[PDB]
Amino acid sequence: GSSGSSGELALWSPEVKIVELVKDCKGLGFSILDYQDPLDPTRSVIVIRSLVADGVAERSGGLLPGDRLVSVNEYCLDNTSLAEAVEILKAVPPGLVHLGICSGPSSG
């Protein structure tokens, strides 16, 4: 059982956190983008672009800019294309929003 040294994805945590976000008419208050692993270029992940000023994201106090988003309202956003990710957040119904997050390189 020789674990990998200076390799295993550390940028994020192996434990995702479900943040309860209350969507509104306009929708959410955050953004997302497509990322590419520095070791695996053939692999992409969705990150938290940024939290709109006083946006649902910030309000709740669970999301942060730089964290890797797992899913939104039970939606596998793994290796998903930005376009797809955005559409998923737009197609998602209003109200409570159960989305996971992977603590990443935060400057806070």
Curated annotation (Swiss-Prot):
Q: Which residues cross the membrane?
A: none
Q: Which domain of life is it from?
A: Eukaryota
Tissues expressing the protein: Expressed in renal tubules (at protein level). Expressed in bladder, testis, ovary, small intestine, colon, heart, skeletal muscle, pancreas and cerebellum in the brain.
PDZ domain location is: 18-102
Cellular compartment(s): Cell junction, Tight junction; Apical cell membrane; Cytoplasm, Perinuclear region
Functional description taken from the UniProt entry: Scaffolding protein that facilitates the localization of proteins to the cell membrane. Required for the correct formation of tight junctions and epithelial apico-basal polarity. Acts (via its L27 domain) as an apical connector and elongation factor for multistranded TJP1/ZO1 condensates that form a tight junction belt, thereby required for the formation of the tight junction-mediated cell barrier. Positively regulates epithelial cell microtubule elongation and cell migration, possibly via facilitating localization of PRKCI/aPKC and PAR3D/PAR3 at the leading edge of migrating cells.
Query: Any domain commentary?
Result: The L27 domain (also called Maguk recruitment domain) is required for interaction with PALS1 and CRB3, and PALS1 localization to tight junctions. The PDZ domain 6 mediates interaction with the C-terminus of TJP3 and is crucial for localization to the tight junctions. The PDZ domain 8 interacts with CLDN1 but is not required for proper localization.
What's the subunit arrangement here? Forms a ternary complex with PALS1, CRB1 and CRB3. Component of a complex whose core is composed of ARHGAP17, AMOT, PALS1, INADL/PATJ and PARD3/PAR3. Forms a heterotrimeric complex composed of MMP5, LIN7B and PATJ; the N-terminal L27 domain of PALS1 interacts with the L27 domain of PATJ and the C-terminal L27 domain of PALS1 interacts with the L27 domain of LIN7B. Component of a complex composed of CRB3, PALS1 and PATJ. Interacts (via N-terminus) with PALS1/PALS (via PDZ domain).
What protein does this entry describe?
Answer: InaD-like protein
By which gene is this protein encoded?
PATJ
Which portion of the entire protein is included?
Answer: 676 to 770 of 1801
